[PDB]
The first five atom37 places (N, CA, C, CB, O) and aatype in JSON, in Angstrom:
{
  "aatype": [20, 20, 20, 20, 20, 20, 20, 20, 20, 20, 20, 20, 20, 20, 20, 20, 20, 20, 20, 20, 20, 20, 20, 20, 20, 20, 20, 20, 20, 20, 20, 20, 20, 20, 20, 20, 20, 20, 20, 20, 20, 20, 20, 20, 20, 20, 20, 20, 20, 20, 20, 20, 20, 20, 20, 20, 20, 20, 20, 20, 20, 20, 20, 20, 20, 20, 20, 20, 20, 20, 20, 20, 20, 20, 20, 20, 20, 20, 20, 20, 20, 20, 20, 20, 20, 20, 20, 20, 20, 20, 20],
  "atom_mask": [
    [1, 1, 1, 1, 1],
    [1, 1, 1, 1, 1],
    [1, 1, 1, 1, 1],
    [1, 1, 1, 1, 1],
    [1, 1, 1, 1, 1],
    [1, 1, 1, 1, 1],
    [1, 1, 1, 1, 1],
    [1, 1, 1, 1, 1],
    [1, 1, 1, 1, 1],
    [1, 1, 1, 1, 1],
    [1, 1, 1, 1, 1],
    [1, 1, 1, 1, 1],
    [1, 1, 1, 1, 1],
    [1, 1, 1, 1, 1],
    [1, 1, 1, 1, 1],
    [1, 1, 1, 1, 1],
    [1, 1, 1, 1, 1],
    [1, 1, 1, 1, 1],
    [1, 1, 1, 1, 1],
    [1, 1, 1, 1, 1],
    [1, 1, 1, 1, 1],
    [1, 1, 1, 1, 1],
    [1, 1, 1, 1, 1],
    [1, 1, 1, 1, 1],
    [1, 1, 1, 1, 1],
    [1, 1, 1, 1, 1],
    [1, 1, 1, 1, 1],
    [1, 1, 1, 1, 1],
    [1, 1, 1, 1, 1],
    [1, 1, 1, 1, 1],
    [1, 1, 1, 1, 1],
    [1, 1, 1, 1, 1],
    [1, 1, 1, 1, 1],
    [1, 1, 1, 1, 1],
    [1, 1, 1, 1, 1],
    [1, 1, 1, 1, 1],
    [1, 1, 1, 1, 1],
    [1, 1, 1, 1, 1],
    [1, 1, 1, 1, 1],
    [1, 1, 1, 1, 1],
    [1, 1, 1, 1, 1],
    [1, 1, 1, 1, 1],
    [1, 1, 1, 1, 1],
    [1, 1, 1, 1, 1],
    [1, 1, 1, 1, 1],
    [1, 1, 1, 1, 1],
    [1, 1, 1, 1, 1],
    [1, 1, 1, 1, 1],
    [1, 1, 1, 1, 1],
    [1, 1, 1, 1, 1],
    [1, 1, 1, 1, 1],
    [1, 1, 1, 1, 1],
    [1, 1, 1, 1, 1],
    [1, 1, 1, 1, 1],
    [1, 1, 1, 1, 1],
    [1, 1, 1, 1, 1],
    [1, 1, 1, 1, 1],
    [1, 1, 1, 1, 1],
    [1, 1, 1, 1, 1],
    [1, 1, 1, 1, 1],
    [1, 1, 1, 1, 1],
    [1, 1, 1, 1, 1],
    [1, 1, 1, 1, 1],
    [1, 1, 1, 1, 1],
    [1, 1, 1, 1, 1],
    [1, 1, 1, 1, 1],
    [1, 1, 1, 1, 1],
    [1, 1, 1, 1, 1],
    [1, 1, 1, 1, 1],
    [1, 1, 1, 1, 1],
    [1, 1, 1, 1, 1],
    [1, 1, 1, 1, 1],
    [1, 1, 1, 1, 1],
    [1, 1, 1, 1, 1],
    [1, 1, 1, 1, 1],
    [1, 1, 1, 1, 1],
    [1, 1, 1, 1, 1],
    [1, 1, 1, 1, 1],
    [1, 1, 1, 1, 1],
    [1, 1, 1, 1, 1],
    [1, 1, 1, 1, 1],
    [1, 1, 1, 1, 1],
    [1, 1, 1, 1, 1],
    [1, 1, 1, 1, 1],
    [1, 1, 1, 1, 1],
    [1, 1, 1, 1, 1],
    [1, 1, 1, 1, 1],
    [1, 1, 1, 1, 1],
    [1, 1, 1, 1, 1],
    [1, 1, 1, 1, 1],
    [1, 1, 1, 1, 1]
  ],
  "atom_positions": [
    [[107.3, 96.84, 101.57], [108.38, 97.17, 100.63], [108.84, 95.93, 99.88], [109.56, 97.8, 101.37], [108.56, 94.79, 100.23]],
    [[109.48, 96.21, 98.98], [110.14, 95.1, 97.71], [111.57, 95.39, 98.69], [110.17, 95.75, 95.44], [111.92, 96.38, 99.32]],
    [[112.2, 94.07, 98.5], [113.62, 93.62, 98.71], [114.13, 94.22, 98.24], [114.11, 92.59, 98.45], [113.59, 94.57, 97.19]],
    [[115.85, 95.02, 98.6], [116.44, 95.49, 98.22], [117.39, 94.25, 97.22], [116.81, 96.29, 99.22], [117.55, 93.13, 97.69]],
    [[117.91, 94.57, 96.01], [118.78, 93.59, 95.09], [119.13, 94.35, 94.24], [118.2, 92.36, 94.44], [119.61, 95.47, 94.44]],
    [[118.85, 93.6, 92.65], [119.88, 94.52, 91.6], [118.83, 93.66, 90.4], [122.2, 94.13, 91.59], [118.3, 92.57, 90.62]],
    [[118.72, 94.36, 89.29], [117.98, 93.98, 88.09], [118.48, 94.47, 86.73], [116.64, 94.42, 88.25], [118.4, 95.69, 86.52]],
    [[118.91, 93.79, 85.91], [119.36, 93.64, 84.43], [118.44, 94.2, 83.28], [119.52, 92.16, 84.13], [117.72, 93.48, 82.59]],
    [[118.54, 95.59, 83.16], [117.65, 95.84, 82.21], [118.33, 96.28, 81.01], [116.71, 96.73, 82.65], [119.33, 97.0, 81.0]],
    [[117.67, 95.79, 79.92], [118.01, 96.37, 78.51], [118.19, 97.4, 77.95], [117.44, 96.17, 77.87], [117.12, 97.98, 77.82]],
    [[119.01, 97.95, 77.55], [118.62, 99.47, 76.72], [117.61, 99.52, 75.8], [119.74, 100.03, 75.85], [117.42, 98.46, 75.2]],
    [[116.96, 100.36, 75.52], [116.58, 101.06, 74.27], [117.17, 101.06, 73.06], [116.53, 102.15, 74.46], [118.34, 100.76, 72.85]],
    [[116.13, 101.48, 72.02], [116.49, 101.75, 71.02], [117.11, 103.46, 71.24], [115.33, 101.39, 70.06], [117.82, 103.97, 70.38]],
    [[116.84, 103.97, 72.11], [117.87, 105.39, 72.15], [118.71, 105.12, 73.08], [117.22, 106.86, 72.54], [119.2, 106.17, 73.49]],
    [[119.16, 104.13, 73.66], [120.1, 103.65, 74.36], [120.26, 104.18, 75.54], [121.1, 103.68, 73.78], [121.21, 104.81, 76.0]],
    [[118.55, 103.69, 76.34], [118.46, 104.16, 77.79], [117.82, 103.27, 77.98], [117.96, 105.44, 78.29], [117.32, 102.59, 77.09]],
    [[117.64, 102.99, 79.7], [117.26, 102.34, 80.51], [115.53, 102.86, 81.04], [118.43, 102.4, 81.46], [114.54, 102.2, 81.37]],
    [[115.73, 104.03, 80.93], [114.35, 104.98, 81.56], [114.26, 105.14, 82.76], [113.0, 104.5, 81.34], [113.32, 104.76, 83.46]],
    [[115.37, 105.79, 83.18], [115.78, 106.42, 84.91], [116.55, 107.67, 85.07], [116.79, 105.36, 85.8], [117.74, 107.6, 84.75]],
    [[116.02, 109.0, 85.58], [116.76, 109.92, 85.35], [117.84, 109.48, 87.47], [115.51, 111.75, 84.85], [117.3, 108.84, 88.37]],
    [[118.53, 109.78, 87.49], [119.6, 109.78, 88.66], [119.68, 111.15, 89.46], [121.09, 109.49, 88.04], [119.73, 112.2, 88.82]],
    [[119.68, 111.15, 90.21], [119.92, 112.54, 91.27], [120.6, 112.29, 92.56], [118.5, 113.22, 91.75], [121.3, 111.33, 92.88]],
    [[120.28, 113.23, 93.2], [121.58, 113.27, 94.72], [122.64, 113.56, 94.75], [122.0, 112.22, 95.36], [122.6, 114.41, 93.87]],
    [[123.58, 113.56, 95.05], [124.85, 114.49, 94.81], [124.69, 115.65, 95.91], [124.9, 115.17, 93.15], [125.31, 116.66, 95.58]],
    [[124.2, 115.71, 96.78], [124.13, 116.92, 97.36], [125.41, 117.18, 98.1], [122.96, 117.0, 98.19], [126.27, 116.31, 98.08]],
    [[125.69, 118.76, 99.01], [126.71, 118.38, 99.82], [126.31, 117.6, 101.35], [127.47, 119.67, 100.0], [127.21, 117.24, 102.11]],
    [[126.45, 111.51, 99.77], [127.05, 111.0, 98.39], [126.53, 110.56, 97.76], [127.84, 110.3, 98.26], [126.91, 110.37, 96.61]],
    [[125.03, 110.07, 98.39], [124.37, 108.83, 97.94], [123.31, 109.26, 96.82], [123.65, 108.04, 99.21], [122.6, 110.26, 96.82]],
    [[123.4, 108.1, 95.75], [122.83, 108.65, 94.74], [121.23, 107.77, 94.58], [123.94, 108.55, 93.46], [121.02, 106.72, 95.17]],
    [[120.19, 108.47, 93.64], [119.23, 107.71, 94.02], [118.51, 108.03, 92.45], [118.44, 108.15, 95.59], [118.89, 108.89, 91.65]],
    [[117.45, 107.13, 92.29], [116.9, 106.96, 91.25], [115.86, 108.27, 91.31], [116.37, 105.52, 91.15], [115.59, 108.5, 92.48]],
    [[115.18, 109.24, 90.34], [114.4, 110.77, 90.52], [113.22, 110.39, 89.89], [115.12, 112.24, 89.74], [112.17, 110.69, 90.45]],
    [[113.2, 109.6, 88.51], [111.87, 109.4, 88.14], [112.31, 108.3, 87.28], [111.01, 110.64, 87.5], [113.42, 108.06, 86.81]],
    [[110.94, 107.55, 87.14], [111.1, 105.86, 86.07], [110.29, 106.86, 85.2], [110.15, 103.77, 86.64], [109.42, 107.62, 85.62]],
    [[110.77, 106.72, 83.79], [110.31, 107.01, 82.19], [109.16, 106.26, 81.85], [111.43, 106.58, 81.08], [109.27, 105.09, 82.2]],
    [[108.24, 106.5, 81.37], [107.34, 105.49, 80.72], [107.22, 104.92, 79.62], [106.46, 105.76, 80.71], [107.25, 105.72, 78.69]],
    [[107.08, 103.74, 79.29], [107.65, 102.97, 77.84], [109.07, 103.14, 77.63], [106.97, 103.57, 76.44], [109.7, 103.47, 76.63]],
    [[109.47, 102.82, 78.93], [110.78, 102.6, 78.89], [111.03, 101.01, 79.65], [111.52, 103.93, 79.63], [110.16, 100.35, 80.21]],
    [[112.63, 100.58, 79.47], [112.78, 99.51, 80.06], [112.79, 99.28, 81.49], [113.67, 99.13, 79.63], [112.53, 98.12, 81.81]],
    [[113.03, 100.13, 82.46], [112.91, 100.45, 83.66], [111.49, 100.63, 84.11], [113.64, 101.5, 83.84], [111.32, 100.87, 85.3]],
    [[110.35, 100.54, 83.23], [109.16, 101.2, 83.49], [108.67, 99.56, 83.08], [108.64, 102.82, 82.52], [108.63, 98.85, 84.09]],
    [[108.43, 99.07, 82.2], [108.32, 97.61, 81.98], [108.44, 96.71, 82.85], [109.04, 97.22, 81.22], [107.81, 95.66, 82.95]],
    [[109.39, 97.19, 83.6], [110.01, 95.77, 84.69], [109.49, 96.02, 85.57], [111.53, 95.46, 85.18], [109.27, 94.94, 86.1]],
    [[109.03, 96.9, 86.27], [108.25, 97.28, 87.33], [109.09, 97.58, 88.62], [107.26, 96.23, 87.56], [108.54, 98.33, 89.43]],
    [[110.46, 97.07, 88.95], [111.2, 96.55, 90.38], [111.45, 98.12, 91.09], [113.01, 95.51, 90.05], [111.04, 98.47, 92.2]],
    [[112.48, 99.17, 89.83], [113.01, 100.23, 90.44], [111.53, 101.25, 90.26], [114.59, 100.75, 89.65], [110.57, 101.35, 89.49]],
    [[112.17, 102.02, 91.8], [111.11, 103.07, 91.59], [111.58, 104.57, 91.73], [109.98, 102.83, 92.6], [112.79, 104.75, 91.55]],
    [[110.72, 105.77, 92.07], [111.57, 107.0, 92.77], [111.83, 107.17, 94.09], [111.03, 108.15, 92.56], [110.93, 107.19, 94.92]],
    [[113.2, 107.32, 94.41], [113.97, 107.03, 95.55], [114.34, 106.2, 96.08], [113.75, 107.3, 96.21], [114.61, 106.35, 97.27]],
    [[114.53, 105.02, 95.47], [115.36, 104.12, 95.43], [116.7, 104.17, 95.81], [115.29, 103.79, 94.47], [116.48, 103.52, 96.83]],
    [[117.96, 104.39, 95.87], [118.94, 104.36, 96.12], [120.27, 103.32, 95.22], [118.61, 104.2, 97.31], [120.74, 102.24, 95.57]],
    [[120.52, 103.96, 94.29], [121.76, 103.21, 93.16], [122.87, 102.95, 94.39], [122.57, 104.54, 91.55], [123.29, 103.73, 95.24]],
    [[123.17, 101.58, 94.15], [124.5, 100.83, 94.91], [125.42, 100.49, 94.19], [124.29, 99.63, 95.59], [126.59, 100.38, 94.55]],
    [[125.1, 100.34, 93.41], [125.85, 99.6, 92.18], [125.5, 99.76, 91.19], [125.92, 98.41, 92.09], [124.33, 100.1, 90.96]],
    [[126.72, 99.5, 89.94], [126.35, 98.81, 88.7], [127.42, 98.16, 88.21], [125.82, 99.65, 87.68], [128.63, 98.39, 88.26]],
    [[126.46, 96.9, 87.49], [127.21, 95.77, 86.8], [128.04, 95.22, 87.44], [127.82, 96.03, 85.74], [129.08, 94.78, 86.94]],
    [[127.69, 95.13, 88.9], [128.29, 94.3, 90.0], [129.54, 94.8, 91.18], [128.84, 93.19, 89.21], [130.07, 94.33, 92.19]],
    [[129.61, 96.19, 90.23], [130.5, 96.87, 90.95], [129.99, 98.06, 91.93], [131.38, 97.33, 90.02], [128.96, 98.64, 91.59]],
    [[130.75, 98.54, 93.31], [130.17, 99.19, 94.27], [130.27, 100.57, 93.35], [130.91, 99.08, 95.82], [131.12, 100.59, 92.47]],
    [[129.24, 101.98, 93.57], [129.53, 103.16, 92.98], [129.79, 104.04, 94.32], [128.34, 103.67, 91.95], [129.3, 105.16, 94.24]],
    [[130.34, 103.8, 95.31], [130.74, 104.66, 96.96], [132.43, 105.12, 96.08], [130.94, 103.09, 99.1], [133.34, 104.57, 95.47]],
    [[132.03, 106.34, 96.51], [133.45, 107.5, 95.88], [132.9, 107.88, 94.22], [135.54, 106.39, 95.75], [133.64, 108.41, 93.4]],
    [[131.94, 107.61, 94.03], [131.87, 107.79, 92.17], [130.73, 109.22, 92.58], [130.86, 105.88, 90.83], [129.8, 109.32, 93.38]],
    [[131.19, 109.94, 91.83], [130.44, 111.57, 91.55], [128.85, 110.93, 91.18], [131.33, 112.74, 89.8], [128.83, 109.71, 91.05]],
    [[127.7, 111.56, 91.03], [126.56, 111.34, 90.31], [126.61, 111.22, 88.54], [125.7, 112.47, 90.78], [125.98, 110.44, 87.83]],
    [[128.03, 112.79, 87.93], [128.11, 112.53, 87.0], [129.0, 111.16, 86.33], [128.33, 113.58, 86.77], [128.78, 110.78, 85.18]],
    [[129.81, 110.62, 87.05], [130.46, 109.48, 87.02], [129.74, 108.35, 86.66], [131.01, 109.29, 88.1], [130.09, 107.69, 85.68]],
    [[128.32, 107.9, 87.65], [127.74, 106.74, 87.83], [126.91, 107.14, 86.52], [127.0, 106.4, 89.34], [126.46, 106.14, 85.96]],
    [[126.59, 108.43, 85.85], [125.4, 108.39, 84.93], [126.04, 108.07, 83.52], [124.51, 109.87, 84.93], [125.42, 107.38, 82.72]],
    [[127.33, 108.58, 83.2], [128.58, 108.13, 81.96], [128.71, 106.62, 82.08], [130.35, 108.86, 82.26], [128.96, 105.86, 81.14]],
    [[128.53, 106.33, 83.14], [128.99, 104.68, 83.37], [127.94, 104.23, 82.79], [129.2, 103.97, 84.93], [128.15, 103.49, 81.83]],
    [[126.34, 104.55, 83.23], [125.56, 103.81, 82.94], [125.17, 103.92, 81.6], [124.74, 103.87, 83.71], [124.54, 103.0, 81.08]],
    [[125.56, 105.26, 80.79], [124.98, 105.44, 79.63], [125.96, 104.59, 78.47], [124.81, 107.06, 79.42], [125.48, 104.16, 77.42]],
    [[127.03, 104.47, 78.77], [128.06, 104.07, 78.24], [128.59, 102.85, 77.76], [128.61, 104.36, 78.8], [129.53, 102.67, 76.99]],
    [[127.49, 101.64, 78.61], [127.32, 100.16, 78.43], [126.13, 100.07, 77.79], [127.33, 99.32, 79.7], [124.98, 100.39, 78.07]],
    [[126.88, 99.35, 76.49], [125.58, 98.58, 75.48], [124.95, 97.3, 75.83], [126.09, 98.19, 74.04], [125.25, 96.32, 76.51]],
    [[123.95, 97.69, 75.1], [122.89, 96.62, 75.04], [122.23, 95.95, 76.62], [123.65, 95.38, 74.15], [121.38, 95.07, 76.45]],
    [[122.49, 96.21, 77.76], [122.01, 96.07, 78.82], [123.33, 95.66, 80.27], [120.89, 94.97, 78.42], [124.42, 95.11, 80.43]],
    [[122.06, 96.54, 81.2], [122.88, 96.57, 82.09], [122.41, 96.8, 84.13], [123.69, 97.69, 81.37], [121.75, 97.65, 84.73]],
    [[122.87, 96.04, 84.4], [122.77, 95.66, 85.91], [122.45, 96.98, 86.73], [124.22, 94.98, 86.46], [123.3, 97.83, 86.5]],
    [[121.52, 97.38, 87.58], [121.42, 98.45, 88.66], [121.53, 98.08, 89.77], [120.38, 99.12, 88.72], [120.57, 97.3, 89.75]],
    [[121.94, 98.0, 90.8], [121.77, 97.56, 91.98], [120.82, 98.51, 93.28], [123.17, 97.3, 92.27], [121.73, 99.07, 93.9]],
    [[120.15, 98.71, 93.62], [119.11, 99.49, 94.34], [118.77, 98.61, 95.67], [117.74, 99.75, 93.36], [118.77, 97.38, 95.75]],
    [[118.43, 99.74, 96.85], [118.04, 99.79, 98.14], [116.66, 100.61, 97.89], [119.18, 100.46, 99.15], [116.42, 101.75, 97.47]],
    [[115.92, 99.59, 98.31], [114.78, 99.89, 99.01], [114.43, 100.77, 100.19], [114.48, 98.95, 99.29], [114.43, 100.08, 101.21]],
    [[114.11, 102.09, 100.44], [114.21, 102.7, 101.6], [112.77, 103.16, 102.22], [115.13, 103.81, 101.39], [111.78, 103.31, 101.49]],
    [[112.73, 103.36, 103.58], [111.22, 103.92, 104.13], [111.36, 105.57, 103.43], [111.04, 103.92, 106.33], [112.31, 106.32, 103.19]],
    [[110.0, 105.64, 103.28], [109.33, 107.24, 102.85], [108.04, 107.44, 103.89], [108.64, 107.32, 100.92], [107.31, 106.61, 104.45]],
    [[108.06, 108.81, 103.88], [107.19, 109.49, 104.45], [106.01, 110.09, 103.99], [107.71, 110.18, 104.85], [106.2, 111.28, 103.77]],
    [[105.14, 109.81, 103.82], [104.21, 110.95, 103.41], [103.24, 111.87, 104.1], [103.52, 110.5, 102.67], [102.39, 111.63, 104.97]],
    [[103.55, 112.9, 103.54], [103.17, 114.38, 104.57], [102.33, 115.72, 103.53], [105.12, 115.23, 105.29], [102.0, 116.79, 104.04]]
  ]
}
């Protein structure tokens, strides 16, 4: 596995990162798929199922899924993810 940390990626020219967000079930929210030819897809670090901790340095524990995704869409020109690395299974 890659280290869990946090990585600074740029927006787009449509003013995305290239990460759709999920989880919310009946807290923890997690990355669903990296976009391709996107900035998230370029950098290589985040992947699917990852786990969002943060952004822009701040904790997202108590923030809804729709909360953390307004937050993220909402900061220009680039912006901090913070992600956990977790074990998977394959079956």
């Amino acid at each position: 596995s890659m280290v869990p940390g946090k990585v600074t990626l740029q927006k787009d020219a449509q003013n995305l990162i290239g990460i759709s967000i999920g989880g919310g079930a009946q807290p923890c929210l997690y990355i669903v798929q990296v976009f391709d030819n996107t900035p998230a897809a370029l950098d290589g670090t985040v992947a699917a199922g990852d786990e969002i901790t943060g952004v822009n340095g701040r904790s997202i524990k108590g923030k809804t899924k729709v909360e953390v995704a307004k937050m993220i869409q909402e900061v220009k020109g680039e912006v901090t993810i913070h992600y956990n690395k977790l074990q998977y299974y394959k079956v």
